[PDB]
Amino acid sequence: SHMRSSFVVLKSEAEFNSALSKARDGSLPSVFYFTAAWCGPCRLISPVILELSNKYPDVTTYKVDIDEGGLSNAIGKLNVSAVPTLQFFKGGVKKAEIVGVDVVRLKSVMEQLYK
């Protein structure tokens, strides 16, 4: 289970631009989860994100399916070249990135940044 508002599935580039402005200009604690429907291993990450959302309720995590219409431009805006990629924002700036499946590091980075 999870809190509904803490996990957001973006559907348009306008939605992504809004979320990135929240993470930068708004200085809101934000995680961007870059994935693709055709990436099987990527699906290992989503359950862990939801599990951790309860521990860090101020954080909002955004799922960015790069195979969605328009969202293909998100990988250019944040310099993404592999799936899964997780990017972590705090204080209006990018604080960390995890490329590939690394669940242990995901748990450790969330604690390090947002505890």
Side-chain angles (χ1 to χ4, degrees):
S1 64
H2 63 110
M3 297 159 295
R4 186 211 74 263
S5 66
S6 61
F7 189 81
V8 174
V9 183
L10 302 166
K11 295 300 187 185
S12 75
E13 188 179 357
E15 293 193 347
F16 171 84
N17 296 331
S18 180
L20 186 56
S21 73
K22 286 177 189 295
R24 289 184 162 165
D25 183 70
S27 293
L28 288 167
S30 309
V31 178
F32 292 88
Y33 165 41
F34 288 88
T35 186
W38 48 257
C39 171
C42 291
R43 293 183 177 186
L44 295 165
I45 288 171
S46 166
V48 179
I49 287 168
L50 303 175
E51 179 177 19
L52 296 176
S53 66
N54 308 269
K55 289 175 71 76
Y56 313 100
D58 51 324
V59 179
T60 304
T61 297
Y62 300 97
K63 178 182 173 187
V64 187
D65 189 328
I66 64 170
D67 201 65
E68 283 269 337
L71 291 181
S72 58
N73 299 273
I75 56 179
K77 294 190 180 300
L78 287 174
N79 181 17
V80 175
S81 54
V83 291
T85 293
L86 293 155
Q87 292 187 355
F88 304 78
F89 287 76
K90 191 182 180 70
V93 299
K94 199 181 302 191
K95 293 296 192 178
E97 178 181 74
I98 301 172
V99 179
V101 176
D102 192 346
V103 169
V104 175
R105 190 175 180 200
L106 163 58
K107 292 181 178 185
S108 297
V109 168
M110 287 292 294
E111 176 69 4
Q112 175 58 31
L113 296 181
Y114 303 119
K115 63 183 178 178

